[PDB]
């Protein structure tokens, strides 16, 4: 699957290096990760929520 949402808004990382490949190690073959993963990585959440 080619990544299909090029918009990376309110994100902690751009979409470019987020659209890369991780290494092919003992648990995973070659595949593609997500655009907005770093925004989901350690974001301090909404205080009013």
UniProtKB/Swiss-Prot annotation:
Q: What is this protein called?
A: Exosome complex exonuclease RRP6
Task: Show which residues constitute the signal peptide.
Answer: none
What is said about its interaction partners and assembly? Component of the RNA exosome complex. Specifically part of the catalytically inactive RNA exosome core complex (Exo-9) which may associate with the catalytic subunits RRP6 and DIS3 in cytoplasmic- and nuclear-specific RNA exosome complex forms. Exo-9 is formed by a hexameric base ring of RNase PH domain-containing subunits and a cap ring consisting of CSL4, RRP4 and RRP40. RRP6 specifically is part of the nuclear form of the RNA exosome complex; the association appears to be mediated by Exo-9 and not by DIS3. Interacts with LRP1. Interacts with NPL3, NOP53 and PAP1.
> Misc remark for this entry?
Present with 2160 molecules/cell in log phase SD medium.
Q: What does this protein do?
A: Nuclear-specific catalytic component of the RNA exosome complex which has 3'->5' exoribonuclease activity and participates in a multitude of cellular RNA processing and degradation events. In the nucleus, the RNA exosome complex is involved in proper maturation of stable RNA species such as rRNA, snRNA and snoRNA, in the elimination of RNA processing by-products and non-coding 'pervasive' transcripts, such as antisense RNA species and cryptic unstable transcripts (CUTs), and of mRNAs with processing defects, thereby limiting or excluding their export to the cytoplasm.
Which part of the complete protein is shown?
A: 148 to 196 of 733
Q: Where in the cell is it found?
A: Nucleus, Nucleolus; Nucleus
Family the UniProt entry places it in: Belongs to the exosome component 10/RRP6 family.
Effects seen without this gene? Deletion mutant is temperature-sensitive. Impaired growth at 37 degrees Celsius. Impaired growth at all temperatures, nonviable at 37 degrees Celsius. Mutant is defective in the 3' processing of the 5.8S rRNA and accumulates a discrete species, 5.8S + 30, that is 3' extended by 30 nucleotides. Accumulates 7S RNA. Accumulates 5' external transcribed spacer (ETS) RNA. Accumulates extended forms of snR40 small nucleolar RNA (snoRNA). Accumulates U24 + 3 snoRNA. Accumulates poly(A)+ snoRNAs.
């Amino acid at each position: 699957f080619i990544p299909l949402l090029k918009e990376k808004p309110n994100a902690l990382k751009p979409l470019s290096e987020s659209l890369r490949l991780v290494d092919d190690d003992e648990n995973n073959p070659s595949h593609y990760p997500h655009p907005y993963e770093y925004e989901i990585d350690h974001q301090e959440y909404s205080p009013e929520i």
